[PDB]
């Protein structure tokens, strides 16, 4: 039991650390990308509020 449960929490921490390294950079880039991109989106949509004639 205990040697099989240890081998499960072993592989759980391995599968976590292999994500944590890669999630942390993405999270540190989050909202300074979001708010630039939303400012860009609303400004870009204003170019389509304009029917051709």
């Amino acid at each position: 039991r205990d040697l099989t449960l240890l081998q499960r929490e072993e592989r759980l921490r391995d599968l976590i650390e292999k994500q944590d390294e890669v999630l942390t950079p993405v999270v540190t880039s989050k909202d300074p990308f979001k708010d630039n991109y939303t400012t860009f989106a609303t400004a870009l949509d204003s170019t389509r509020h304009q029917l051709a004639i």
């Binding site: 081998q7 929490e9 759980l12 921490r13 976590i16 944590d20």
Partner: protein, 49 residues
């Protein structure tokens, strides 16, 4: 006959099973002493989940 023979049948079965388990225990008790060197990050686990 049935008492003298069946006492030998039931005993020889247990004389194997307890010798088999007496070696499997010793394999497990050495595999355990490989993991005891690695895991020092238990309290980290549920935070990092």
């Amino acid at each position: 006959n049935l008492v003298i023979e069946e006492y030998q049948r039931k005993a020889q079965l247990l004389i194997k099973q307890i010798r088999d388990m007496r070696s499997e225990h010793v394999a497990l008790q050495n595999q355990q002493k490989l993991a005891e060197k690695v895991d020092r990050k238990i309290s980290d686990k549920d935070e990092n989940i």
